[PDB]
Amino acid sequence: IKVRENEPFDVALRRFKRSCEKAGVLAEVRRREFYEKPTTERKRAKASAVKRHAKKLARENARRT
Amino acid sequence: PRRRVIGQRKILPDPKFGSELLAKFVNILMVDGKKSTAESIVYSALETLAQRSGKSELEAFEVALENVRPTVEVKSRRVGGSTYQVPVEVRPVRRNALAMRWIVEAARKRGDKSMALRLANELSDAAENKGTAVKKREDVHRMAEANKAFA
Amino acid sequence: KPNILIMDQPTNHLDMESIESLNMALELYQGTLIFVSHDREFVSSLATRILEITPERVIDFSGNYEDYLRSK
Amino acid sequence: NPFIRFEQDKKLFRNALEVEGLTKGFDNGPLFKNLNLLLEVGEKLAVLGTNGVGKSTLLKTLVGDLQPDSGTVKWS
Amino acid sequence: FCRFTAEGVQEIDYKDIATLKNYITESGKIVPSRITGTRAKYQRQLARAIKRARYLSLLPYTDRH
Amino acid sequence: RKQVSDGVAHIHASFNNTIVTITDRQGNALGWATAGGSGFRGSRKSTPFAAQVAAERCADAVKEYGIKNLEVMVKGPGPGRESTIRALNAAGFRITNITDVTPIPHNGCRPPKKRR
RNA sequence: CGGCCGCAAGGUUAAAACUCAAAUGAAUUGACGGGGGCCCGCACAAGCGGUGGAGCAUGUGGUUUAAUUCGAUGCAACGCG
Numbered sequence: 001i002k003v004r005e006n007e008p009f010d011v012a013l014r015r016f017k018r019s020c021e022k023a024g025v026l027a028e029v030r031r032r033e034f035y036e037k038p039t040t041e042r043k044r045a046k047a048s049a050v051k052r053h054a055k056k057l058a059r060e061n062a063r064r065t
Numbered sequence: 066p067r068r069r070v071i072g073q074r075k076i077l078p079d080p081k082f083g084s085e086l087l088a089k090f091v092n093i094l095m096v097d098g099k100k101s102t103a104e105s106i107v108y109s110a111l112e113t114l115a116q117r118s119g120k121s122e123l124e125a126f127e128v129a130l131e132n133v134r135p136t137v138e139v140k141s142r143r144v145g146g147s148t149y150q151v152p153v154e155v156r157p158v159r160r161n162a163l164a165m166r167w168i169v170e171a172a173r174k175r176g177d178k179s180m181a182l183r184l185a186n187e188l189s190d191a192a193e194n195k196g197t198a199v200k201k202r203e204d205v206h207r208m209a210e211a212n213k214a215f216a
Numbered sequence: 217k218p219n220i221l222i223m224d225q226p227t228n229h230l231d232m233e234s235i236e237s238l239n240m241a242l243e244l245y246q247g248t249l250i251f252v253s254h255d256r257e258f259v260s261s262l263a264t265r266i267l268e269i270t271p272e273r274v275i276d277f278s279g280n281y282e283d284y285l286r287s288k
Numbered sequence: 289n290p291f292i293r294f295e296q297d298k299k300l301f302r303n304a305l306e307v308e309g310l311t312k313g314f315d316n317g318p319l320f321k322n323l324n325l326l327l328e329v330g331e332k333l334a335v336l337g338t339n340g341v342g343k344s345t346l347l348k349t350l351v352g353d354l355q356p357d358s359g360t361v362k363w364s
Numbered sequence: 365f366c367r368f369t370a371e372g373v374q375e376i377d378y379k380d381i382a383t384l385k386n387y388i389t390e391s392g393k394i395v396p397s398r399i400t401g402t403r404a405k406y407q408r409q410l411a412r413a414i415k416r417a418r419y420l421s422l423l424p425y426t427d428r429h
Numbered sequence: 430r431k432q433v434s435d436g437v438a439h440i441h442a443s444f445n446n447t448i449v450t451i452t453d454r455q456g457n458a459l460g461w462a463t464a465g466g467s468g469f470r471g472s473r474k475s476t477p478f479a480a481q482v483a484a485e486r487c488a489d490a491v492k493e494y495g496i497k498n499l500e501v502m503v504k505g506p507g508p509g510r511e512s513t514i515r516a517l518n519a520a521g522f523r524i525t526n527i528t529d530v531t532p533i534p535h536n537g538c539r540p541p542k543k544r545r
Numbered sequence: 546c547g548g549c550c551g552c553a554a555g556g557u558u559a560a561a562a563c564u565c566a567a568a569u570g571a572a573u574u575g576a577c578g579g580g581g582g583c584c585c586g587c588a589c590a591a592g593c594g595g596u597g598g599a600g601c602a603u604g605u606g607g608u609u610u611a612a613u614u615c616g617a618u619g620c621a622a623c624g625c626g
C-alpha cells in the first residue's frame with residue numbers, strides 16, 4: 001500500500017495499490033451477510049458468466065454487415 | 066430541438082455601421098415588432114456614449130459589453146433524485162447573447178427619461194464594471210463559483 | 217409614518233435589546249431609507265446598496281456588503 | 289424589548305432623489321467629487337467611513353439643513 | 365500457464381520462503397490461481413504453507429505490523 | 430512553538446465528512462480542520478471539494494510549528510480521499526509518502542443491518 | 546373432539562355439520578408496471594408574449610323566477626348548435 005518513489009515522483013498515482021482492497025471490500029463488508037444471499041448472489045453470478053461463453057459462440061450471426 | 070440541428074440565421078448588417086453585432090443588439094431591445102423605433106434609440110445611445118468615452122464604437126460597444134458577458138453559468142441536472150445546479154461553460158456565441166439581453170434588461174429598470182437616456186447611462190457604467198448589468202455577472206458568477214463542488 | 221428615513225446613526229445609545237427591536241422594525245419596514253450607522257452587524261443585517269465614501273474614491277453598490285468586506 | 293414598527297402613510301413608486309452633483313467640501317478639498325446616484329425606491333445604502341469622512345454633512349445637504357455648493361438634489 | 369509446480373511433483377513446505385514470496389501480493393494476501401495459473405491440488409497446499417509461515421512469523425499477515 | 434520540522438497528516442475520510450489533522454511523528458496532535466467545521470454542513474461536506482477546504486484550513490493553525498515534510502496516512506471510505514492529498518501538495522508541505530491505513534477485519538465483528 | 550409425546554410453546558394421528566360450481570397447472574393474444582432498451586412530437590430545456598390580479602363582452606353552472614325554451618357538459622362541453 002505504501003508508495004515512496006524516492007526522489008522524482010511529484011505524482012501520487014497509487015492505482016497500483018488502490019486497486020487491491022478498498023474498491024471492493026470496504027464498500028461490501030459493511031452489511032448484508034445473511035449467509036444465504038451470498039450463495040444465491042454468487043450462484044447467479046457465475047451462472048451469469050457461463051452464458052458469456054455461449055455468446056462467444058455467437059460469432060456465426062450474419063446480420064449482413 | 067430533439068432530432069434535427071438548426072444551422073443559423075443570417076442577420077442583415079447594421080445600416081449606419083456595417084456590423085452584425087449591433088443589429089442583434091437592436092433586435093433584443095426591439096419590442097412589439099417596431100424596428101423603426103428601436104434603431105432610433107440604439108444610435109442615440111451610442112451617440113451619447115461615444116463622446117463620453119472619446120472614440121466611436123471600439124470602446125462604446127466592444128470593451129463596455131465584454132465587461133458584462135459571463136463565462137460560467139449554472140443549469141439544473143436532475144438525474145437520479147438531485148435538485149442541485151452544476152456549473153457549465155457558456156459558448157462564445159451565447160456569451161454575447163447573454164450580454165445584450167442583460168444590458169437591455171438592466172436598462173429597462175432605472176426610469177429616468179426616454180429609453181435613449183436610460184440605455185446610454187447603462188452602457189457607460191458597464192465600461193468600468195459598475196452598472197447593474199455587470200452586477201448580474203457577479204450574481205451568476207459568484208453562484209457558479211460557490212457551487213464548484215459539483216462538476 | 218414617513219416614506220424615507222434618513223436615520224443618521226440609530227444604534228448610538230441603544231440597549232442591545234432595543235437594537236433587536238430596531239432591526240426587526242427595519243426589516244419589516246416597506247418604505248425607503250438611508251443611514252450611515254457604523255455598526256458592523258447592522259449594515260450586515262440589512263444593507264444591500266452600500267455607498268462607501270472616501271476622500272478620493274467613492275464606491276457605489278459593490279453588493280450585499282459581504283463581497284465588499286471580503287474583497288477589501 | 290420595545291415594540292416599534294414604522295408604517296407608511298403613502299407608497300412611493302418611481303424613485304426618491306436622483307442626485308447628480310453636490311461639490312460639497314467645507315474648507316479643504318472636497319471629501320467627494322461627483323456622487324451621481326439614484327434610488328428607484330431602493331433601500332438601505334449604508335454609508336460607512338472613518339471618523340471624519342463626511343456622512344453626516346452629506347445627509348444634511350441631502351435633507352435640507354445645508355445645501356450643496358453647486359448642484360441640486362430634489363425629492364419626489 | 366501452470367508451469368511452476370506441475371513438474372516438481374511434491375508437497376510444498378513452509379520453509380521455502382523464496383518461492384512463497386512469488387505467490388504473494390504486496391499487501392500480504394495470497395494470489396488466486398486464476399491469475400497465477402497454479403492447479404487446484406497444489407494451491408490448497410500453497411495456501412496451507414503460507415498460513416503456517418505466517419504463524420511462525422516468516423511472512424506478514426498484512427504489509428504493516 | 431517548538432519548531433517541529435517533520436510531521437504526520439492523518440486523513441479521516443468518510444461517506445459523511447473528511448476530518449483532516451496534522452500531528453507530529455510521535456502522535457501528539459498540533460491542529461486539525463474538519464470539512465464540516467468549515468461551513469459545509471449537509472450534503473456538501475460529502476464532496477471532494479469540501480475536503481480541500483479542510484486541507485487548506487489545516488495548513489494554518491500549524492504554520493507556527495513550521496512543517497516542511499509531511500507523512501499522510503488516509504483512513505475510511507469516502508470522497509475526501511484524493512482531493513485532500515492533492516491539496517496537501519499545493520499548500521507547501523512536501524509529502525514524503527502516502528499510506529492507506531484502514532481497518533479491514535479478518536472476518537471478525539458482525540456488521541449492522543440498517544438499510545432497506 | 547379423543548389418544549400418545551412435551552416443563553411450556555406445541556407436534557403427531559385426524560374428522561363432521563354447513564356452503565360453492567367451481568378452485569388449479571402450463572401456455573397464447575392484449576393491456577398495464579413507481580421493469581429494461583431505442584425513437585418521435587412546442588413534450589421538456591433554451592426565449593418571446595399571454596392567463597390567473599382589475600373594468601367590460603360572451604358562454605356555462607348554480608340562485609331566483611310564472612318563464613328564465615332545449616341540446617352540448619373531462620382532454621374531445623363552456624365567443625359551442
Ligand SMILES: Nc1ncnc2c1ncn2[C@@H]1O[C@H](COP(=O)(O)OP(=O)(O)OP(=O)(O)O)[C@@H](O)[C@H]1O
Nearest residue numbers: 225314319336337338339340341342343344345346
Ligand atoms: N463642521 C465641520 N467642520 C469641519 N469638518 C467637518 C465638519 N462637519 C463635517 N466635517 C468633516 O466631514 C467628514 C464627514 O462628516 P461626518 O461628520 O459624517 O463624519 P464621520 O466621522 O464619518 O461621522 P459621525 O462621527 O458623525 O458618525 C468628517 O470626517 C469631518 O472631517
Ligand SMILES: [Mg+2]
Nearest residue numbers: 541542543544
Ligand atoms: Mg435499529
Ligand SMILES: [Mg+2]
Nearest residue numbers: 568569570571
Ligand atoms: Mg400451488
Ligand SMILES: [Mg+2]
Nearest residue numbers: 596597598599
Ligand atoms: Mg376571476
Ligand SMILES: [Mg+2]
Nearest residue numbers: 615616617618
Ligand atoms: Mg343527451
Ligand code: NA
Nearest residue numbers: 252342343344
Ligand atoms: Na456622520
